[PDB]
Amino acid sequence: QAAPNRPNYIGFRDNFIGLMYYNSTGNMGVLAGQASQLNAVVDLQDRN
Amino acid sequence: ALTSTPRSQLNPPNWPAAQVYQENPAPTTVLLPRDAEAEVQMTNSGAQLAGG
């Protein structure tokens, strides 16, 4: 006999959830004036 | 006789500290960006100051 295969669609997460590194302190981003590179976006692991 | 400091010997071997061109620069006024007292108080309060 034989059958169909189960279907799996495989597409990118909603609002592209996870594509950018949010909530991960290691790979956090930055947004600072071109001088004084002091970060201005400091993320944590609790604010999800 | 109008551009040479009256010397006692041509090619004197140690020009003293007065007849040689000292360079005075204007005092370097720096704008200390921050007051540490207030920053420490705020960071103790729980804030997490971060930025330029």
Side-chain angles (χ1 to χ4, degrees):
Chain A
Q1 293 177 335
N5 289 337
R6 328 224 317 204
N8 236 10
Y9 291 179
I10 294 169
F12 282 78
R13 284 291 190 50
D14 173 315
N15 303 257
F16 294 71
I17 287 284
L19 211 53
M20 281 175 328
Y21 263 111
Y22 284 103
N23 284 167
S24 286
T25 182
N27 314 337
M28 81 185 168
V30 285
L31 171 143
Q34 193 54 300
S36 86
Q37 313 324 100
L38 271 43
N39 184 297
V41 75
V42 165
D43 173 350
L44 302 103
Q45 282 103 29
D46 62 27
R47 74 171 50 120
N48 164 37
Chain B
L2 81 173
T3 51
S4 86
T5 51
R7 274 191 301 310
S8 46
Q9 53 184 0
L10 312 93
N11 174 276
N14 184 37
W15 281 98
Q19 43 194 230
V20 55
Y21 273 10
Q22 303 304 160
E23 301 276 40
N24 83 336
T28 81
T29 311
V30 55
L31 161 63
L32 261 183
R34 325 181 171 191
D35 52 328
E37 292 136 30
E39 271 206 30
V40 165
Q41 283 314 359
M42 191 55 28
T43 191
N44 284 7
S45 176
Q48 153 164 10
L49 281 293

